[PDB]
Amino acid sequence: PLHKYPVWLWKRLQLREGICSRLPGHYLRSLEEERTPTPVHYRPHGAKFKINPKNGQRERVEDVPIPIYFPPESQRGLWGGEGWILGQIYANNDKLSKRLKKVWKPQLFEREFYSEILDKKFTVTVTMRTLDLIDEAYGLDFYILKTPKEDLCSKFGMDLKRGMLLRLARQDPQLHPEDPERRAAIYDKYKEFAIPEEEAEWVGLTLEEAIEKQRLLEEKDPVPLFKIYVAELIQQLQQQALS
Amino acid sequence: MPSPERLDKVVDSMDALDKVVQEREDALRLLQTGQERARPGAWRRDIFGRIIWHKFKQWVIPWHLNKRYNRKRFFALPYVDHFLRLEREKRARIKARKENLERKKAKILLKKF
Amino acid sequence: SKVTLPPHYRYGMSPPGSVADKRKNPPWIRRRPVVVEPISDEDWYLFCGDTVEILEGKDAGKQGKVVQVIRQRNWVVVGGLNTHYRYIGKTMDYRGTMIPSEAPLLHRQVKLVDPMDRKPTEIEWRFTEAGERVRVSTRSGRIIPKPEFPRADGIVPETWIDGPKDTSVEDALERTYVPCLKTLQEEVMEAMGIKETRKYKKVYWY
Amino acid sequence: IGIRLTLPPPKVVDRWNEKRAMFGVYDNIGILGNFEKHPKELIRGPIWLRGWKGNELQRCIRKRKMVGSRMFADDLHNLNKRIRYLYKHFNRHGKFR
Amino acid sequence: ARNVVYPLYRLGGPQLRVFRTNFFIQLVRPGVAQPEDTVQFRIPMEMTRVDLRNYLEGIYNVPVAAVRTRVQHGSNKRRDHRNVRIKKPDYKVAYVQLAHGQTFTFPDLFPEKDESPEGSAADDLYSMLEEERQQRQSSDPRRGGVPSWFGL
Amino acid sequence: TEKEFMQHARKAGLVIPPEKSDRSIHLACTAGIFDAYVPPEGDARISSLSK
Amino acid sequence: GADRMSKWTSKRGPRSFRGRKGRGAKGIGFLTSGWRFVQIKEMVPEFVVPDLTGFKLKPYVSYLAPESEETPLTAAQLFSEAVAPAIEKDFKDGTFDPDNLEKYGFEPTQEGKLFQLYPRNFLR
RNA sequence: UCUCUUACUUUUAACCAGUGAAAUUGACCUGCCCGUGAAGAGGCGGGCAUAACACAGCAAGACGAGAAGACCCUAUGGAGCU
RNA sequence: CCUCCGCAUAAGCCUGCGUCAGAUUAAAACACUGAACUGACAAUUAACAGCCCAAUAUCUACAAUCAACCAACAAGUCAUUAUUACCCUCACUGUCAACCCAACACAGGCAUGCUCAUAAGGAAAGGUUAAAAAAAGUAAAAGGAACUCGGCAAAUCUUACCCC
RNA sequence: GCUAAACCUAGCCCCAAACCCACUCCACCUUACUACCAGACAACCUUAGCCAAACCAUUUACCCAAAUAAAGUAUAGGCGAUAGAAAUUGAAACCUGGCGCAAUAGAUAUAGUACCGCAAGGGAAAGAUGAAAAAUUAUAACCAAGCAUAAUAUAGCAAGGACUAACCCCUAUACCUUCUGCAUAAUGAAUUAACUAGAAAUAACUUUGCAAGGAGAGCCAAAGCUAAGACCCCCGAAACCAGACGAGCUACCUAAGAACAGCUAAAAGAGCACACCCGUCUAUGUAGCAAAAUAGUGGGAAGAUUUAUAGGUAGAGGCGACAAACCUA
Ligand SMILES: [Mg+2]
Ligand SMILES: [Mg+2]
Ligand SMILES: [Mg+2]
Ligand SMILES: [Mg+2]
Ligand SMILES: [Mg+2]
Ligand SMILES: [Mg+2]
Ligand SMILES: [Mg+2]
Ligand SMILES: [Mg+2]
Ligand SMILES: [Mg+2]
Ligand SMILES: [Mg+2]
Ligand SMILES: [Mg+2]
Ligand SMILES: [Mg+2]
Ligand SMILES: [Mg+2]
Ligand SMILES: [Mg+2]
Ligand SMILES: [Mg+2]
Ligand SMILES: [Mg+2]
Ligand SMILES: [Mg+2]
Ligand SMILES: [Mg+2]
Ligand SMILES: [Mg+2]
Ligand SMILES: [Mg+2]
Ligand SMILES: [Mg+2]
Ligand SMILES: [Mg+2]
Ligand SMILES: [Mg+2]
Ligand SMILES: [Mg+2]
Ligand SMILES: [Mg+2]
Ligand SMILES: [Mg+2]
Ligand SMILES: [Mg+2]
Ligand SMILES: [Mg+2]
Ligand SMILES: [Mg+2]
Ligand SMILES: [Mg+2]
Ligand SMILES: [Mg+2]
Ligand SMILES: [Mg+2]
Ligand SMILES: [Mg+2]
Ligand SMILES: [Mg+2]
Ligand SMILES: [Mg+2]
Ligand SMILES: [Mg+2]
Ligand SMILES: [Mg+2]
């Protein structure tokens, strides 16, 4: 026979079926965001159309991305939007020669960073692209808070983002006592941030982490039937007496 | 055997007595702790990707240093998802056959009567 | 007492647990199923013990009393009316004792009879407004009663005497239960005076 | 021996069935209904062949196109293999090339 | 008890007590010759020697001096009509030796019956059969096959 | 190479209905004579009207 | 080859396999250094058998007894027939206080006593 | 071993009783000589022979049975190795 | 008359010649009734053997070979102490057989202990006859390798030389 | 007249619709189906190849948005086999069926059972009374090959012409395939029953409809356009690649064991010689006792020995006192 739904809609059906359906709405929308990452290992087309040689005709063009592969070391560290390129090449860049499977790997470096919001020094495996991105963003805090998940490409980066967002939303005693004005100054350096507190928790959470958080949220061990029955009976007694 | 129905009568009488005792116990446990299933457990998902009700086993040391317990795997490793879909499709095929056969039998019955 | 029959099993005038039925339908047997009219439990009127009228057959127009009802094949066996003859005592040197033996009848082959005029009549199940639920005749409109038949217990309750292992009604109905928030274990412990002072301790369930 | 020794049960056919008596009704519905409906829209059946005739390779290709995403795994594997075989047969083998 | 979860005993913990036991035993006749103080039982698999001793001395107040147990393997040789092996259940048998010099001989239950009450459902048909048999066995070799019915 | 014979049959009737049943065999006749009619010894000699 | 379909029992393996498998009997002790088995008296289920000398309740019933409509016992029914009368009386008298439900039969935690209900401390 | 073989015993054998395979088989009412012919005939031409039917042997023929020749060649069929 | 067998343990196997009934049938390479079986009933009883141990430090140079002289090399198969903790006890499992691996009731394969011909365990001939051919033996006049590729085989106990 | 024969209905198939399942108690990741104890390791990765290009070496459709049309167009490409879009267009909510199979068919299915395999894995066969079998009655026979009733008669592809007569007379070199050509002593076939092998386009031809227009959008058109009819087989390698499963045989190794009588003992990878290991030569056997055995005869038998148990190394590999040896006949 046939399935009622196509097999690619099954993930969405599970998302609306159970505890995932009880997950918060903003988290679910962020899960269904499906926005595209910035070109990193390929050059985008500048325009939607392009007049090609061999005929003076305007032809529509689209940029297709490269299936870059991310080892879990990238998730541990802070790379750019770049990973491994698993492709093929021709022997001497001519198609009439052998085709060989090639891998391109990024050049990784170990560097130290400071977070003004977190007031902590982290050692991260970094690359030149993300060093340049930090330079453009004027600070690690700005880079982490400005870059989207589809561009950070790191669970570590998303955890850092959630940490800073929670710090900003809470306005908690960040630095230490005896430095309230410095704490406030660091807080006001990032006003264009700090989404509400109950929304900043679910930032950078995978589906498994979200389901586990929601399951521990609704733990609520059962209440004895004794309390329910006594409440019902006393309400009945009050109703009968007041008449 | 002289009168074998005596054994059946006794067996079902003891079954009824056990039912009565279990009912009283269940009501008392619901009243005092709001629980059924006086054996604690949890819905888990084993190594084959199925959903099972795992009953607990009253150990003497905590689970995080229980060596034998930490060798059982309550998770998927999703090379099992294709097998899950195949089993689902097999179940669907069996159900479709059953419904179609019911339709055919009803049609024959109506054809005669 | 609890034996499951194959999905296509023939009900054949002998009980499924009988030796004759085991001989006739061994577990290896497979044959074409007989297809019967589907009748719900709330429109089967004729019960074991009432008088029916045979509309057709070898004897048409004679009244009789049903002696067995097989609901799995829409069968009602009429007592000694639709009969054929067979021998029962069988040996290799002498066989005799020819007896009449009834053959089953379908439920369209018989009709119910009302005790006023002893005529065939159709029955409709009209729900009485007094609470009970009985049959009603169509042509004349009388209450045809459910006939009294001996039960499957093989007993008569009036001529029943208590055995040495049968509990009497008085001490079988006497209420000794007082509801309480204590378990059977606590109650028997305290009733028999078992003293336990050391406590049960924490155990890890997982 | 191959023939049945008895005559098969006589098969009666009700020519004045509901279906047989109403066969063809509401055909020509476009011709004499101001073309609001096409007769091809009275056809009931599979989603990939309603108002479409097609070859066997064409039928397989169309079925995989229109309904091949919600097919069973073994059925879809069979369809892919059938399309492969039919391609090879209809494009490489036979007379008349 | 059987098919139940035992509470886990911890050192210094209370006594494990069963209030409505789930064990049923059969008193079987020995298939071989046994000492006069030996009583043979057929007990469930989960029952132990201590369990059976306590069972006997608590429910029947039978003084028990010794208990030995063994497991009898049921045959897995019979084939179904589909050539599927039919397994006779494995069971456990126990030999108990009585304590204070008592002896036990297995009783003879079935002998002896002597009853001649009135019957109608089956005895009437038995009288049928017997009378027909006693009246219809009057064949004669001197006749050579001619039916002995007609008066002529 | 694994097949046997079948059709184990017994050709004697028995008393299986009284073994367990709630219906009985309905009889139409009896076993013998309630009391044999002894005929007179000289019935042939007294075959006339009366004596 | 080996019999795949037969159930794996304690009679089937080598000498080491025998004696490790068991038949489902529950342990009543432990093994010490000299292979000596120490039995624990508390690990042996003690049969709680009552006195039946004056007990007038036979394992069967009389047929003269009359039928009754069945009514499975529920927590609501047990509460109604167990705590409702007393709490109604001490509410009508005005002494009922919602804070202390303990004197009506309820208990907050089930750890303190010996026969705890949810984890089912006892046997049967 | 042989000139140069012989005698006996056991097995096998043959007959009687019981149980009871396999390769093979287009159909066969299935002869010899000469000739012929896809070039080596039981079957064709010319002659000759010729009641039917078991059992035990033998191995000249049935280009005898077995294995879609391994030798040789061919295939824009393979594979191992250098 | 045979025994180069056998009895145990291990491993393997898992009720597989114990009783009763059916033997009308059915496998018995035929049969009686029991190894090529149907149903029911019954049995293997622990002392033998499995199933072990509270930590933390610490100790552990000198083979075995009758272990004594002597003699070696390939250099070896076995051990504690100190302090703390600890006073309940005999559970559970294997225990049968004419038996396992070889499609078989298969001249094959199968570890260890014990007597090495037995106190264990077994039967080469269904009956007859006395053909050929064939197989395994025994004996053989005179000759003694003349056989044959070759002393293959058999019988006797055997000298010398060569190649690798 | 034996063996047999025959039978409808279990079920199945393809659609449609609808998103579907799973704790009675107990046990089950250790040797699964095991009541009860102190290192807490852990998954995320471009398929390849057959095949086509008549070799092969770049290349060779197969991916998961309803249709249709643009369009097999633009494009790609040993510019060659072949590969091949998009913009744009527009895609009417409800109805429980069958010119499907009927026991060699239809699911492998009565069952993933029996059986085979160490394992992954492979994988069967089959049933038929009647309202009642609590009718065992007498009917229902008739029909394949194989036989029996009932062996045979000079001579010859088995018959045909005939004839008063079965034979005798006369005439006559089975069939299929393959070939220049076969009675060929070239292939295949014991025989019966059942199953078992021609699938479609461009363009033409015929027959209708309408007609400078045809067509139910798109397309064609200097009589065309629309519609229909008619049309291109079956079995078979040695291969290649991916992923699993295998060292209970065997090769080598690791751990911890065991065995080796007697005599000569030169001291001994010494000699004779048992058990034990191996397999020189002969004979038998060759569908055998045996998918490598038996009898005799032989080589070794305190060592580089033989051997029980558990473990390890695996196929683009392992292991090898190199035999292209062995890695479950
Ligand atoms: Mg013979
Ligand atoms: Mg010639
Ligand atoms: Mg001859
Ligand atoms: Mg010939
Ligand atoms: Mg030949
Ligand atoms: Mg060939
Ligand atoms: Mg060529
Ligand atoms: Mg023994
Ligand atoms: Mg063999
Ligand atoms: Mg003897
Ligand atoms: Mg003999
Ligand atoms: Mg002889
Ligand atoms: Mg003989
Ligand atoms: Mg001589
Ligand atoms: Mg010479
Ligand atoms: Mg010569
Ligand atoms: Mg020699
Ligand atoms: Mg090619
Ligand atoms: Mg080609
Ligand atoms: Mg080539
Ligand atoms: Mg488009
Ligand atoms: Mg089939
Ligand atoms: Mg099949
Ligand atoms: Mg015939
Ligand atoms: Mg002639
Ligand atoms: Mg030629
Ligand atoms: Mg010719
Ligand atoms: Mg030929
Ligand atoms: Mg040829
Ligand atoms: Mg041939
Ligand atoms: Mg090739
Ligand atoms: Mg290769
Ligand atoms: Mg090994
Ligand atoms: Mg030596
Ligand atoms: Mg030697
Ligand atoms: Mg060499
Ligand atoms: Mg070589």
UniProtKB/Swiss-Prot annotation, chain A:
<dbReference type="Pfam" id="PF00830">
    <property type="entry name" value="Ribosomal_L28"/>
</dbReference>
<keyword id="KW-0687">Ribonucleoprotein</keyword>
<comment type="similarity">
    <text>Belongs to the bacterial ribosomal protein bL28 family.</text>
</comment>
<dbReference type="GO" id="GO:0005829">
    <property type="term" value="C:cytosol"/>
</dbReference>
<dbReference type="InterPro" id="IPR034704">
    <property type="entry name" value="Ribosomal_bL28/bL31-like_sf"/>
</dbReference>
<dbReference type="GO" id="GO:0005762">
    <property type="term" value="C:mitochondrial large ribosomal subunit"/>
</dbReference>
<keyword id="KW-0496">Mitochondrion</keyword>
<dbReference type="GO" id="GO:0006412">
    <property type="term" value="P:translation"/>
</dbReference>
<keyword id="KW-0809">Transit peptide</keyword>
<protein>
    <recommendedName>
        <fullName>Large ribosomal subunit protein bL28m</fullName>
    </recommendedName>
</protein>
<dbReference type="InterPro" id="IPR026569">
    <property type="entry name" value="Ribosomal_bL28"/>
</dbReference>
<dbReference type="GO" id="GO:0003723">
    <property type="term" value="F:RNA binding"/>
</dbReference>
UniProtKB/Swiss-Prot annotation, chain E:
<dbReference type="GO" id="GO:0003735">
    <property type="term" value="F:structural constituent of ribosome"/>
</dbReference>
<dbReference type="GO" id="GO:0005762">
    <property type="term" value="C:mitochondrial large ribosomal subunit"/>
</dbReference>
<keyword id="KW-0687">Ribonucleoprotein</keyword>
<keyword id="KW-0689">Ribosomal protein</keyword>
<protein>
    <recommendedName>
        <fullName>Large ribosomal subunit protein uL23m</fullName>
    </recommendedName>
</protein>
<dbReference type="GO" id="GO:0032543">
    <property type="term" value="P:mitochondrial translation"/>
</dbReference>
<dbReference type="Pfam" id="PF00276">
    <property type="entry name" value="Ribosomal_L23"/>
</dbReference>
<dbReference type="GO" id="GO:0005739">
    <property type="term" value="C:mitochondrion"/>
</dbReference>
<dbReference type="InterPro" id="IPR012677">
    <property type="entry name" value="Nucleotide-bd_a/b_plait_sf"/>
</dbReference>
<dbReference type="InterPro" id="IPR012678">
    <property type="entry name" value="Ribosomal_uL23/eL15/eS24_sf"/>
</dbReference>
<dbReference type="GO" id="GO:0005743">
    <property type="term" value="C:mitochondrial inner membrane"/>
</dbReference>
<comment type="subunit">
    <text>Component of the mitochondrial large ribosomal subunit (mt-LSU). Mature mammalian 55S mitochondrial ribosomes consist of a small (28S) and a large (39S) subunit. The 28S small subunit contains a 12S ribosomal RNA (12S mt-rRNA) and 30 different proteins. The 39S large subunit contains a 16S rRNA (16S mt-rRNA), a copy of mitochondrial valine transfer RNA (mt-tRNA(Val)), which plays an integral structural role, and 52 different proteins.</text>
</comment>
UniProtKB/Swiss-Prot annotation, chain F:
<comment type="subunit">
    <text>Component of the mitochondrial large ribosomal subunit (mt-LSU). Mature mammalian 55S mitochondrial ribosomes consist of a small (28S) and a large (39S) subunit. The 28S small subunit contains a 12S ribosomal RNA (12S mt-rRNA) and 30 different proteins. The 39S large subunit contains a 16S rRNA (16S mt-rRNA), a copy of mitochondrial valine transfer RNA (mt-tRNA(Val)), which plays an integral structural role, and 52 different proteins.</text>
</comment>
<protein>
    <recommendedName>
        <fullName>Large ribosomal subunit protein mL45</fullName>
    </recommendedName>
</protein>
<comment type="similarity">
    <text>Belongs to the mitochondrion-specific ribosomal protein mL45 family.</text>
</comment>
<comment type="function">
    <text>Component of the mitochondrial large ribosomal subunit (mt-LSU). Within the mitochondrial ribosomes, required to direct the nascent polypeptide toward the tunnel exit and position the exit at a distance from the membrane surface.</text>
</comment>
Swiss-Prot record, chain G:
<dbReference type="GO" id="GO:1990904">
    <property type="term" value="C:ribonucleoprotein complex"/>
</dbReference>
<dbReference type="Pfam" id="PF09809">
    <property type="entry name" value="MRP-L27"/>
</dbReference>
<keyword id="KW-0809">Transit peptide</keyword>
<dbReference type="GO" id="GO:0006412">
    <property type="term" value="P:translation"/>
</dbReference>
<protein>
    <recommendedName>
        <fullName>Large ribosomal subunit protein mL41</fullName>
    </recommendedName>
</protein>
<comment type="similarity">
    <text>Belongs to the mitochondrion-specific ribosomal protein mL41 family.</text>
</comment>
<dbReference type="GO" id="GO:0005739">
    <property type="term" value="C:mitochondrion"/>
</dbReference>
<dbReference type="GO" id="GO:0032543">
    <property type="term" value="P:mitochondrial translation"/>
</dbReference>
<dbReference type="GO" id="GO:0003735">
    <property type="term" value="F:structural constituent of ribosome"/>
</dbReference>
<dbReference type="GO" id="GO:0003723">
    <property type="term" value="F:RNA binding"/>
</dbReference>
<keyword id="KW-0131">Cell cycle</keyword>
<keyword id="KW-0496">Mitochondrion</keyword>
